[PDB]
Amino acid sequence: PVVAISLLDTSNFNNQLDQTPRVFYLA
Amino acid sequence: PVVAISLLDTSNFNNQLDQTPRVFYLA
Amino acid sequence: PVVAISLLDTSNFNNQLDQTPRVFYLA
Amino acid sequence: PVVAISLLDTSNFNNQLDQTPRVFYLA
Amino acid sequence: PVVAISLLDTSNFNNQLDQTPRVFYLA
Amino acid sequence: PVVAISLLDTSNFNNQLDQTPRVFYLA
Amino acid sequence: PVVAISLLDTSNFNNQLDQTPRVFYLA
Amino acid sequence: PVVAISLLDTSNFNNQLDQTPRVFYLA
Amino acid sequence: PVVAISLLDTSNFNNQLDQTPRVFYLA
Amino acid sequence: PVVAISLLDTSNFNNQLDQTPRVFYLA
């Protein structure tokens, strides 16, 4: 009976990318 | 009976991208 | 009986993109 | 009865990328 | 009965990449 | 002068998802 | 002068997902 | 002068996922 | 002058996943 | 002058995963 062909291609989830640089160009 | 062909292509969810730089160009 | 062919292509949901830079160009 | 062919290709989840440099260019 | 062919290709999860350099270019 | 803060969150492009099953339920 | 803060979060592109099963339920 | 802070979080590209099972349930 | 802080977190590219089982349930 | 801080976290590329079992359940 039960036949289950599954293809789960997930990516890029539940992730936090924090880019908070501090550049002080004092000419 | 039950035949289930599934193709789940999910991406880019439940993720926070915080880009809060601080640039101080003091000429 | 039951035959279920499913193709779920979801993307870019439930995600917050915060871009709040602070640029201080003091000529 | 039960036959289950599964192909799960997940990547890049539940990971935090913190890039917070501090550059002090004092000319 | 039960036949289960599974192919799980996961990568790059639950890992934190902290790059916080401090560069002091004092010309 | 030139200060460029960019945040490009792109996903799910230039990819073909072909689901062409063949089910023969010969009761 | 040139300061470039960039955050490119791309995913799921230029990839083909072919799911072409053949199921013969000859009851 | 040139200061370049870059964060490239790419994943899941240029890869083909072929799932072509052959199931013969000859009851 | 040139200061380049880069963080390249790439994964899961240019790889083929072929799952082509052959199941013969001859009841 | 040239200062280059780089962090390249790559994984899971240019690799083929072939799973082609042959199961003969001759009940």
Swiss-Prot record, chains A, B, C, D, E, F, G, H, I, J:
It comes from the Eukaryota. This is Glycinin A4 subunit. It comes from Glycine max (Soybean). The lineage of its organism: Eukaryota, Viridiplantae, Streptophyta, Embryophyta, Tracheophyta. The chain holds residues 164 to 190 of 563 of the full protein.
